[PDB]
């Protein structure tokens, strides 16, 4: 780990190791890497919180392989869950 970390330009290696089977779309892969690494949550003396995770929205025309990236994120991550808006899924969004 530490050795690979000392090679200048580890960022562009990571950005090209993401969805390794969809053509182009570098910006979305950069955003995927950013949201798949994260950040630092913060509490200022137990009275002020700034979140750490970075949210990513995809808006695209029919046939641009968004579901493929969503599939990749689930194989690559530790704690990832899948839910569908208009379909049949094994988990919903509301508590009950």
């Amino acid at each position: 780990f530490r050795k690979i970390s000392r090679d200048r330009g580890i960022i562009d290696k990571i950005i090209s190791s993401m969805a390794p089977s969809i053509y182009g779309h570098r910006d979305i892969k950069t955003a995927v890497a950013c949201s798949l690494f994260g950040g630092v949550p913060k509490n200022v003396n137990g009275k002020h919180s700034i979140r750490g995770d970075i949210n990513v929205l995809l808006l695209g025309d029919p046939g641009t392989a968004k579901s493929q990236i969503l599939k990749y994120v689930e194989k690559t991550a530790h704690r990832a869950v899948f839910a569908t808006g208009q379909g049949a899924s094994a988990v919903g969004l509301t508590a009950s």
Binding site: A33, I50, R51
Partner: protein, 92 residues
């Protein structure tokens, strides 16, 4: 294990970058720019720094981060506003 740091020697640049992007947004007549954009800038800089298992957020990471937010804002705008901004923000 990686919780990168924000030593404030690097505060002068971002103050003046945010000032310019605020003065430009109202002039062009489009979405407002609020401090959530700067918070996103810093939070993304944290991630770019943590990529290098780093110990002090660099200016290179800040510069890499700036592109993401500026490009998102510029590319989520109408055609006329977009042509104005893609020339105004050419330096970042």
């Amino acid at each position: 294990k990686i919780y990168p740091k924000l030593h404030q020697m690097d505060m002068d640049k971002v103050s003046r970058v945010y000032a310019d992007l605020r003065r430009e947004s109202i002039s062009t007549g489009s979405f407002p720019i609020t401090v959530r954009h700067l918070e996103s800038i810093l939070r993304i800089a944290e991630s770019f720094a943590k990529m290098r298992l780093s110990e002090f957020v660099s200016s290179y990471d800040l510069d890499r981060a700036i592109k993401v937010v500026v490009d998102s804002f510029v590319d989520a705008q109408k055609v006329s506003v977009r042509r104005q901004l893609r020339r105004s923000f050419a330096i970042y």
